């Protein structure tokens, strides 16, 4: 993508540039040429048209742009995903979304099964720590209310 819409914050970009890192925008890797220790990275530049009627630019590849970068040690940071929870806890009734994150109600922060609640970063995705604390406080209130009710009934 472009620097203007990097999913991170801008202070990190400026600091990494100050320390001496080199940036190459609008690219995607395809191959890692090498025998046992990777020697080079075969990658291709990409193009971004204007945004759609929604606000999500569409990428495309250049048919004539191909390049190779020097490589000694490649570190992938493609992202993260949630695990497969049902078979992980021997509870195959855990209602999960297709994306891997589990479902939970909006009001009480309680999942499908009773007693068990779920809140934090596993519900949303790759959110921040402030959202984590928000969900934690909401789940704490939900647990308190539900436990008082269950002790009462």
């Amino acid at each position: 993508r472009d620097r203007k819409n990097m999913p991170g914050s801008q202070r990190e970009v400026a600091h990494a540039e100050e320390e001496g890192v080199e940036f190459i925008w609008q690219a995607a890797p395809e191959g890692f040429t090498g025998d046992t220790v990777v020697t080079g990275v075969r990658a291709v530049r990409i193009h971004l048209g204007v945004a759609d009627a929604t606000g999500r630019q569409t990428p495309q590849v250049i048919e004539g742009s191909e390049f190779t970068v020097q490589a000694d040690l490649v570190i992938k940071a493609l992202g993260f995903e949630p695990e497969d929870l049902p078979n992980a806890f021997d509870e195959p009734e855990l209602k999960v979304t297709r994306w891997g994150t589990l479902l939970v109600d909006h009001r009480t922060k309680m999942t499908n099964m009773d007693g068990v609640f779920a809140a934090g970063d596993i519900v949303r995705g790759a959110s921040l720590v402030v959202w984590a604390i928000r969900d934690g406080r909401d789940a704490a209130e939900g647990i308190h209310a539900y436990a008082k009710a269950k002790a009462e009934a």
Binding site: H47, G49, V50, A53
Partner: protein
């Protein structure tokens, strides 16, 4: 007027279809016939499917059982006046329906309410009834339809048998039902309340309303016809009926059987052209063909001679051309069988038709994209239709078929590629032609003998023949010829001189031949005619010719090719035969041809080789007429062909006259021999013989192409034997016994006079010795030939009489003009009254009459500024009305000078070119005039030589210096009567003070167009004559076109007074008005005002050189140089005294006549009497078909109504009432409104007010802005001044930005429309017609003929169509998308930027005067960058921003088109 159709894709009934159909029909009153009565209509109809459940309920109510098979309903118009006919009509229909055993279910009378139609349309109201019948044999559907059609035909014939008028059958079937009548469109659901039931549901419907040209209605003449609808008129109908009567003899098919005999007269009598097309369509589809098949056969696609189309398409085109003659002309066809629904165009795409697709699987098409109210976000496609294209809906399978899909699927029927090779061509025969047996030419003595035998002079051998064979084009004359008509002259003239050419006024438009060469073809098909219903390969085994005219060697090759199937006819008759020898010769050839055709012969060659001292040559025209009409009458023309060998064909007019009769080929061997003998004598230079021959052939072909395009037709195949001419001065009996159908107003000589003339010429040519060809007087004045109109004595007398300022010399002038031999028709008449004279000072004052004269228009290019200004000031100082002529006017001449003279004109011309019309130009006059067709050259464009346009005229017409600037032969804005009404409405909106005038040319059939244009809110019909001058025109057009103004005027008067419309207009004539007698005769005929024209030029000093088209006028009138302009001699006082003398003469003439004023002699045409020429000519000319008139009654015979007829105003008037501060203080304004498609020419009166207050460029751009929401109206923003900005959220209909002069129009789709802004039409056709300056930014695709006559506009569009940027003279046009065909036709100014994708633009460009390249100099890159930046920041488009985003490498995909005449006249040149 209008036509539209609604169809559902899936194929199931629903009430929504009929609801939307009615809603759309209820929004056409703006294009209709607005009048003063308030109730009279002009014809409206709808055509839907049969609601079986409704009639089942009805018959259940009656008392019978509810049947299973679909019922059949038939609507009939029965006589109402005499009940004694209803019984016979019921009798016939019942005895012919029960003839097969069908169970009649009953009768029914449809509810009506006659309280809503007018009164003239009610006295002709018939009785309307419906029959309900059923099926009892369990017959299939196709056989049911066949039987119903046969029953209908038999009933029609039987009713014809009893001669019972006023009987009709609307539609008789089980799938379709038609509700049509002679009421107003909107009131339809109030006339036929049956359509308000909750069961009338269908899956398709077609609606139409027609524009009545005459005011006398007739119910069965209202579309939709039986299984067809139509818009416009067909140029050639009189030529198709003959070919249909010819094909009548070889049509039969086992799908009909014995009943086929009862289908012979396929075309009845009295039905309009659309009706004939409808009937032949129904016959051709009742055999098994599908609707697209018969459509492609009837109206073929124009054969583009490029490999840019699939080959199977080309083979199908060849086949469909070979099987049936085309029916060209304006047509937006909407046909529908019981299964398919097809919409289609003509060859050229003359009339618009646009459609749209909703989300519900519903397609809605018509003439305006706003007639139906639909949600703007529930659409999926807004499409248009190009020329020859078509759209189809398959209801049996429920599928939409676009253009290419349908053409492919239809080519997937039969192997059309394998059959086009079954024919035999001609090129292979001419290349392998035997180079032996070459003929030895005659000795020069016999050649001169044979040439004198035809009265053929020698001046033609250098004036009209030498320039043709030298360069390869026709000759050009520079003054209107005023020689006497053929029947009056005594010297022998060619018989062709009695046949004038036909052309089309505003009813059907002309077509340019210098630019539209891709659409016209001159193929000829020998061995062509065959069975029209058969489907096999024996139909495409024939001979094909590239031209009808052929040389001698080619003719010998073809004759040897024909083998032993040739037949020769003697075209000579004995000199000593007797007084009636011509009748015997014609009878002999007529019986001989009919004897030879049955014997087995198949090709009749008619040659005149048998000419000798004892045998004179029969006029080949009469021979061809006789033989063709006999073969048509005897059901034999289909079996044979007809080749003719003439002996006098030298011009381009004789061949056209001969082909219009019915001949196929022509080989004038005397012309080739003369060319050869004049070449071997060494006067052309060092050019080879065959090269000159080729140039000659090409010139003849181009002349015939021009003469075919003048009428409006496109293909020669539908012109052969059409009778499209005009006969003058021949007996009715002869012209109707030996010519198919030609109008003969006045009779003339018969056969004996022609025999005498021919024998006289034969005797004076053969029996004596001639050594030298005489000069002959036919084009310019010579003493040896016949008389002329402007002789030396007459002109010198007039000049002396106007210089000495004396009246008695003018009297001598008039007496000399009068005592001349009879030369023109108006001479034969004589005034006659029963009164006694009065003192000369009892008639009206001199000024009271001088307030009626004007001068006709003259071009600023073919005259000098000095002479033009002199005429203008002379006409202004007297108090009469002057002229400005085509070519604009100098602005500095708008206000008076210190000497007290107004050097501005009074009448402005808006011609086919629109070379100077601006905001200010249309607001410096008191009258308007639409120059439809000029006097000397009908249906031709305003010609002007290239080297005459200096810097002055080039900067006055927004053109390039020194280039032949020819006006478009068509008008591009007047295609039908509704368009002319729209143009008049615009021209009256732009100037609320003046009035608009129309100029017509006298010819037969002008009465209909007169009664039509009178209802178009006009108030002056200026009838020109054929004896009027010009600037530069081909001699053939001047000599062989038009009729004297007497006939046209006496016809217009009668037709206008018959329809009670005479009291609403004014009638004015000109042409040859020289002395007072002619003026008073014209006033007697019905005219009120008068024009003089060329005579005025004689008063200025013109010496009649007739060499004005070379810029060397000796008296310095038609001069554009420097040394020649100083020779001017004229003076306005000359014109002053001329007009004063004419006024005094007419005053004295009316005084001696007896009356007191002119207002009492106008229309009293019984004061004229016809006398004879003498006791020696023995002709029978009867002008009585003019001397009759219609008794008016209450309303007078003149214009009793002062002031123009105002027009209904649109919302713009209310706009003026809101924008007061803009007129009182000068501050910006921002307005917004909701528009509909019934708001014509919005924002025009605001432009008028702005240009009246400030000026052309007195306001800063973007001063006032107006935002409209929804579909706009027609001709948006006509003539906008700088500052006004009209933004639209939606789409426009047509003529958007017409005549722009500084406005800024922006069109864009709505924000809530999920549509690609570069693949859906957002505007219509002829965008920016004749604009002058201003920016235009579109956000969609344009129609056809986009940006024509552009002069200073800067437009940005993401599309184009056929003939885009035609004749672009200046400005810029950025185009982002595929273009149509024939791009930049004849462009000579401006620059174009095209954005190709598949790199195919060189396959579509018409590289004649423009070159296309890549963008090279960075200056042009920056220019295009600026333009696209403004476009994307003004419309906020998506594709523009996309292109601009990936700008780094996308510039290599651009093509730049620049004319060739400006490669070295630019500051920054093209190439490095």
């Amino acid at each position: 007027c209008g036509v539209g159709f609604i169809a559902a894709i899936d194929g199931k009934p629903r009430r929504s279809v009929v609801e939307k159909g009615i809603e759309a029909l209820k929004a056409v009153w703006h294009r209709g016939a607005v009048d003063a009565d308030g109730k009279t209509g002009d014809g409206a109809g709808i055509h839907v499917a049969v609601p079986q459940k409704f009639f089942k309920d009805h018959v259940k109510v009656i008392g019978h059982r509810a049947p299973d098979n679909k019922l059949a309903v038939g609507q009939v118009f029965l006589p109402r006046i005499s009940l004694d006919a209803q019984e016979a009509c019921r009798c016939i229909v019942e005895t012919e329906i029960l003839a097969f055993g069908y169970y009649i279910y009953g009768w029914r009378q449809v509810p009506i309410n006659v309280d809503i139609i007018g009164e003239k349309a009610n006295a002709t109201r018939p009785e309307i009834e419906q029959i309900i019948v059923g099926n009892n044999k369990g017959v299939s559907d196709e056989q049911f339809e066949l039987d119903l059609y046969i029953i209908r035909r038999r009933i029609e014939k039987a009713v014809k048998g009893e001669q019972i008028n006023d009987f009709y059958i609307c539609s008789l079937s089980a799938r379709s039902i038609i509700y049509k009548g002679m009421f107003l469109a909107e009131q339809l659901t109030t006339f036929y309340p049956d359509l308000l039931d909750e069961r009338f549901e269908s899956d398709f419907a077609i609606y139409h309303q027609r524009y009545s040209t005459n005011t006398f209605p007739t119910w069965p003449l209202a579309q939709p016809f039986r299984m067809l609808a139509h818009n416009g008129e067909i140029n050639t109908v009189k030529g198709n009926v003959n070919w249909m009567k010819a094909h009548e003899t070889r049509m039969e098919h086992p799908a009909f059987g014995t009943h086929m005999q009862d289908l012979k007269p396929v075309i009845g009598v009295g039905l309009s052209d659309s009706g004939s097309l409808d009937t032949v369509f129904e016959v051709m589809v009742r055999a098994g063909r599908t609707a697209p098949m018969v459509k492609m056969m009837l109206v073929p696609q124009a054969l583009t001679s490029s490999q840019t189309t699939p080959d199977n398409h080309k083979a199908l085109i060849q086949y469909c051309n070979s099987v049936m003659e085309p029916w060209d002309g304006p047509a937006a066809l909407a046909m529908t069988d019981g299964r398919w629904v097809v919409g289609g165009m003509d060859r050229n795409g003359l009339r618009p038709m646009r459609y749209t697709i909703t989300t519900d699987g519903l397609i809605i098409g018509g003439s305006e994209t706003g007639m139906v109210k639909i949600d703007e976000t529930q659409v999926i496609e807004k499409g248009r239709l190009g020329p020859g294209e078509m759209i189809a809906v398959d209801l049996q399978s429920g599928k939409l078929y676009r253009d290419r899909e349908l053409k492919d699927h239809l080519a997937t029927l039969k192997p059309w590629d394998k059959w086009v090779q079954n024919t035999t061509h001609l090129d292979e025969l001419v290349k392998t032609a035997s180079l032996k047996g070459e003929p030895s030419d005659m000795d020069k003595a016999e050649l001169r003998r044979r040439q004198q035998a035809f009265g053929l002079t020698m001046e033609d051998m250098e004036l009209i023949l030498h320039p043709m064979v030298e360069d390869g084009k026709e000759a050009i004359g520079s003054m209107g010829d005023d020689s006497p008509i053929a029947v009056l002259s005594d010297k022998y003239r060619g018989l062709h001189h009695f046949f004038r050419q036909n052309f089309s006024q505003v009813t059907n438009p002309p077509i340019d031949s210098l630019r539209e060469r891709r659409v016209m073809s001159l193929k000829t098909r020998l061995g062509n005619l065959g069975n029209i219903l058969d489907e096999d390969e024996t139909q495409t085994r024939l001979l094909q010719l590239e031209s009808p005219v052929l040389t001698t060697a080619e003719f010998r090759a073809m004759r040897d090719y024909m083998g032993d199937t040739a037949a020769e006819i003697d075209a000579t008759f004995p000199v000593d035969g007797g007084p009636e020898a011509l009748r015997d010769a014609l009878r002999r050839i007529r019986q001989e041809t009919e004897d030879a055709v049955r014997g087995g012969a198949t090709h009749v060659i008619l040659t005149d080789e048998a000419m000798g001292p004892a045998r004179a040559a029969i006029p080949a025209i009469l021979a061809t007429g006789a033989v063709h009409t006999h073969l048509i009458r005897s059901n034999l023309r289909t079996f044979t062909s007809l080749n003719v060998r003439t002996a006098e064909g030298l011009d381009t007019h004789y061949f056209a006259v001969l082909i219009g009769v019915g001949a196929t080929t022509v080989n004038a061997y005397l012309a080739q021999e003369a060319i050869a003998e004049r070449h071997r004598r060494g006067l052309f230079g060092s050019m080879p013989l065959e090269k000159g021959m080729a140039n000659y052939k090409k010139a003849i072909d181009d002349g015939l192409l021009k003469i075919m395009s003048k009428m409006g037709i496109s293909v020669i195949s539908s012109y052969r034997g059409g009778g499209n001419f005009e006969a003058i001065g021949l007996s009715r009996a002869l012209v109707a016994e030996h010519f198919p159908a030609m109008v003969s107003r006045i009779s003339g000589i018969g056969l004996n006079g022609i025999q005498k003339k021919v024998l006289e010429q034969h005797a004076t040519a053969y029996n004596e010795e001639v050594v030298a060809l005489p000069v002959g007087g036919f084009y310019r004045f010579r003493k040896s030939g016949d008389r002329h109109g402007w002789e030396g004595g007459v002109i010198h007398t007039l000049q002396q009489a106007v210089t000495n300022d004396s009246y008695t010399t003018f009297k001598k002038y008039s007496e000399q003009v009068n005592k001349r031999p009879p030369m023109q028709l108006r001479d034969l008449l004589e005034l006659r009254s029963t009164k006694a004279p009065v003192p000369v000072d009892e008639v009206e004052s001199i000024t009271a009459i001088r307030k009626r004269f004007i001068t006709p228009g003259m071009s600023m290019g073919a005259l000098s500024p000095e002479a033009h200004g002199t005429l203008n000031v002379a006409m202004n100082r007297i108090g009469a009305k002057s002229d400005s002529g085509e070519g604009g006017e100098d602005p500095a001449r708008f206000r008076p000078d210190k000497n007290g003279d107004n050097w501005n004109s009074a009448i402005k011309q808006v011609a086919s070119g629109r070379f100077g019309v601006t905001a200010e130009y249309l607001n410096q006059c008191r009258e308007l005039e639409i120059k439809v067709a000029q006097g000397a050259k009908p249906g031709e464009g305003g010609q002007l030589p290239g080297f005459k346009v200096t810097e002055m005229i080039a900067r006055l017409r927004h053109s390039t210096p020194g280039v032949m600037l020819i006006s478009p032969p068509p008008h591009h804005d007047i295609y039908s009567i509704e368009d002319l009404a729209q143009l008049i409405y615009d021209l009256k909106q732009i100037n609320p003070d003046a009035k608009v005038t129309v100029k017509l040319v006298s010819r037969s059939g002008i009465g209909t167009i007169a009664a039509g244009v009178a209802k178009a809110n006009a108030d002056i019909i200026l009838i020109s004559g054929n004896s009027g001058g010009t600037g530069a025109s081909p001699q053939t057009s001047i000599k062989f076109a038009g009729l004297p103004w007497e006939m046209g005027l006496s016809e217009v008067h009668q037709v206008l007074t018959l329809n009670r419309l005479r009291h609403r207009v004014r009638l004015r004539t000109d042409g040859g008005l020289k002395t007072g007698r002619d003026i008073v005769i014209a006033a007697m005929l019905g005219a009120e005002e008068f024009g003089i024209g060329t005579a005025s030029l004689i008063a200025m000093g013109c010496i009649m050189v007739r060499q004005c088209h070379s810029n060397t006028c000796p008296v310095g009138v038609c001069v554009q140089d420097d040394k020649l302009r100083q020779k001017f001699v004229g003076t306005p006082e000359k014109v002053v005294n001329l007009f004063t003398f004419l006024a005094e003469e007419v005053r004295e003439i009316l005084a001696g006549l007896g009356f007191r004023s002119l207002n009492e002699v106008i229309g009293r045409t019984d004061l004229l009497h016809q006398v004879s020429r003498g006791a020696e000519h023995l002709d029978d000319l009867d002008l009585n078909p003019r001397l009759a008139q219609v008794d008016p009654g209450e309303n007078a015979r003149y214009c009793t109504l002062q002031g123009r007829n105002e027009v209904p105003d649109t919302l713009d008037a209310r706009i003026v009432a809101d924008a007061r501060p803009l007129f009182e203080e000068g501050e910006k304004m921002q307005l917004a409104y909701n528009a509909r498609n019934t708001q014509r020419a919005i924002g025009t009166r605001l432009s008028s007010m702005v240009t009246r207050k400030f000026g052309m460029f007195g306001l800063q751009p973007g001063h006032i802005t107006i935002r409209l929401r929804g579909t706009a109206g027609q001709s948006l923003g006509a003539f906008a001044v700088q500052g006004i900005k009209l933004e639209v959220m939606g789409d426009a209909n047509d003529y958007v930005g017409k005549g722009l002069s500084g406005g800024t129009i922006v069109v864009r789709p709505t924000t809530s429309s999920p549509l690609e802004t570069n693949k859906n039409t957002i505007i219509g056709n002829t965008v920016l017609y004749g604009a002058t300056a201003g920016k235009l930014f579109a956000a969609g695709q344009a129609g056809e003929r986009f940006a024509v006559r552009n002069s200073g506009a800067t437009v940005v569009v993401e599309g184009c169509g056929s003939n885009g940027c035609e004749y672009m003279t200046g400005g810029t046009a950025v185009i982002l998308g595929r273009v149509g065909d024939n791009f930049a036709a004849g462009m000579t100014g401006g620059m174009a930027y095209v954005y190709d994708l598949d790199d195919s633009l060189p396959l579509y460009i018409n590289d004649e005067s423009v070159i296309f390249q890549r963008i090279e100099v960075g200056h042009y890159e920056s220019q295009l960058k600026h333009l696209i930046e403004e476009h994307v920041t003004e419309t906020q488009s998506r594709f523009a921003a996309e292109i601009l985003n990936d700008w780094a490498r996308e510039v290599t995909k651009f093509w730049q088109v620049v004319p060739k005449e400006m490669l070295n006249r630019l500051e920054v040149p093209v190439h490095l």
